[PDB]
Design a protein around this ligand. Structure first.
Ligand SMILES: [O][B]1([O])O[C]([C][N]S(=O)(=O)N2[C][C][C][C]2)C2=[C][C]=[C][C]=C21
Ligand SMILES: [Cl-]
Ligand SMILES: [Cl-]
Ligand SMILES: [Cl-]
Ligand code: NA
Ligand SMILES: [Zn+2]
Ligand SMILES: [Zn+2]
Ligand SMILES: [Zn+2]
Length: 231
């Protein structure tokens, strides 16, 4: 029942409950002449919510906050953006205006500034070196090394064994890489192996775009990234 790109109008947001207190959010956006779905995460944090990633733009992120209030009814108090691209930080200003404390690593904040993207307010400490992990409310944040971007973080939810890979992990339906202008293609397989070694118990793996699956999504992503390298 996970919603697909054809099932979400651009401008609307859907939520999918993965486990007790854990949801993904799904939005869509027009880019380069196609329409893409995009995922983020919502994790219950006591009587508050932690948001992982915007819904890819101001309009979608306003719709995200509305759908969260409608369907969950707890306040989003903190948000973490997992890298500097617009599907992760586009909408940070909407979050900020709604009273959400927005966070990213120092590397993400700097890259967003260089790129011209919205800049989360707070800086996460302890994520500057490959293999670093820190606990941030009900999730563990992990920097696996450069992959889809040099700053990409992944997010693990220990209570539910949910691994949110963000854009470093591809859905199975995606068999080609795409625009890897900001990617470190050469390091990406090693960074995926580091995720595999640090979170081998993950039961549910959420890619940045598209359908969730199991840990197979990690090997799939390596296969796709290597195939692109060889073109
Ligand atoms: O997913 B991103 O974080 O990564 C980059 C490059 N990905 S892309 O191949 O251009 N693409 C495929 C999925 C949607 C865009 C990006 C650019 C613009 C908006 C968002 C993103
Ligand atoms: Cl704040
Ligand atoms: Cl704060
Ligand atoms: Cl992508
Ligand atoms: Na990519
Ligand atoms: Zn990206
Ligand atoms: Zn603050
Ligand atoms: Zn993305």
């Amino acid at each position: 029942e996970y919603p697909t790109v054809s099932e979400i109008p651009v401008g609307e947001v859907r939520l999918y409950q993965i486990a007790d207190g854990v949801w993904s959010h799904i939005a869509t956006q027009s880019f380069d002449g196609a329409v893409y779905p995009s995922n983020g995460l919502i994790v219950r944090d006591g009587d508050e919510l932690l948001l992982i990633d915007t819904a890819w733009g101001a309009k979608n992120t306003a719709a995200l906050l509305a759908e969260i209030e409608k369907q969950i009814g707890l306040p989003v108090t903190r948000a973490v953006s997992t890298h500097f691209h617009d599907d992760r930080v586009g909408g940070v200003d909407v979050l900020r205006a709604a009273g959400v404390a927005t966070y990213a690593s120092p590397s993400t904040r700097r890259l967003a500034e260089v790129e011209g993207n919205e800049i989360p307010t707070h800086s996460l400490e302890g994520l500057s070196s490959s293999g670093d992990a820190v606990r941030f409310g009900p999730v563990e944040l992990f920097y696996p090394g450069a992959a889809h971007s040099t700053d990409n973080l992944v997010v693990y939810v220990p209570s539910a064994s949910v691994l949110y890979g963000g854009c470093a992990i591809y859905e199975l339906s995606r068999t080609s890489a795409g625009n890897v202008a900001d990617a470190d293609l050469a390091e990406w397989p090693t960074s995926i192996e580091r995720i595999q070694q640090h979170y081998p118990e993950a039961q549910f793996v959420i890619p940045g775009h598209g359908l969730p699956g199991g840990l197979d999504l990690l090997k799939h992503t390596t296969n796709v990234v290597k195939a692109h390298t060889n073109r």
